[PDB]
């Protein structure tokens, strides 16, 4: 929450790449596990299918061929190469955490993606121009002022009631 | 909106240069 209100971290493309790689990693995690479990070959005779696998078998325990058709027809495209598939699973989340890191190196220096100048020049001149970007900066300003005195006590911030940004009523 | 007009050439080359690179490699692959 510090990082939202002081750095506007959600707006930083390096974090956005990171979000994509973590949520895409989880997607790859789930969709690959679910695909394997639902393209298994029948290699035993019970309803617990976990026993039909010998780690020394030569054979693929599921059907790449049927998996590929399923996903080509459901989603338009599919993996066909098992090696690229598990390499891509490494790449996606590993690449996303790296992008996020770069953005934090930026923030070590307060080198933030905090503003869009073009929005602020319009906003400052046109009191009817409002976007989700300006609404979020107003939140950010709330976080800074309401949380700083106690969050950075060594600063001896004293904010009289009357300076504390607040909307109506609240 | 008072945007940076260097942003247009920046965006344009950001796309064109690396995309050109890939296209060149792919076509020369398809012909051998």
């Amino acid at each position: 929450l510090f990082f939202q209100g002081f750095h506007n971290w959600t707006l930083n493309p390096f974090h956005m790449m990171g979000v994509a790689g973590v949520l895409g990693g989880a997607l790859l995690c789930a969709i690959h596990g679910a695909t394997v479990e639902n393209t298994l070959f029948q290699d035993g005779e019970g309803a617990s299918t976990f026993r039909a696998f010998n780690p020394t078998q030569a054979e693929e325990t599921y059907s790449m061929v049927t998996a590929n058709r399923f996903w080509s027809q459901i989603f338009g495209i599919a993996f066909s190469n098992k090696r690229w598939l598990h390499f891509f699973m490494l790449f996606v989340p590993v690449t996303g955490l790296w992008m996020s890191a770069i953005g934090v190196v930026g923030l070590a220096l307060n080198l933030r993606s905090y503003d869009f100048i073009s929005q602020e020049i319009r906003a400052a001149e046109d009191p009817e121009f409002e976007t989700f970007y300006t609404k979020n900066l107003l939140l950010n300003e709330g976080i800074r002022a309401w949380m700083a005195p106690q969050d950075q006590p060594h600063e001896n911030f004293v904010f009289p009631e009357e300076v504390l940004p607040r909307g109506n009523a609240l | 909106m008072e945007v940076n007009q260097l942003g247009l050439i920046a965006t344009a080359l950001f796309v064109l240069v690396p995309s050109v690179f890939l296209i060149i490699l792919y076509v020369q692959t398809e012909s051998q």
């Binding site: 338009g76 495209i77 066909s80 | 007009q5 942003g7 965006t11 796309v15």
Partner: peptide
């Protein structure tokens, strides 16, 4: 010009989708 630029990139991606699906490398069983 910025609006046009965002829409153009978006349109290129939708065309990419088309070719990626319908003109993919067909997977074959070798």
């Amino acid at each position: 010009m910025e609006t046009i630029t965002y829409v153009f990139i978006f349109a290129c991606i939708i065309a990419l989708f088309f070719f990626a699906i319908f003109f993919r490398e067909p997977p074959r069983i070798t």
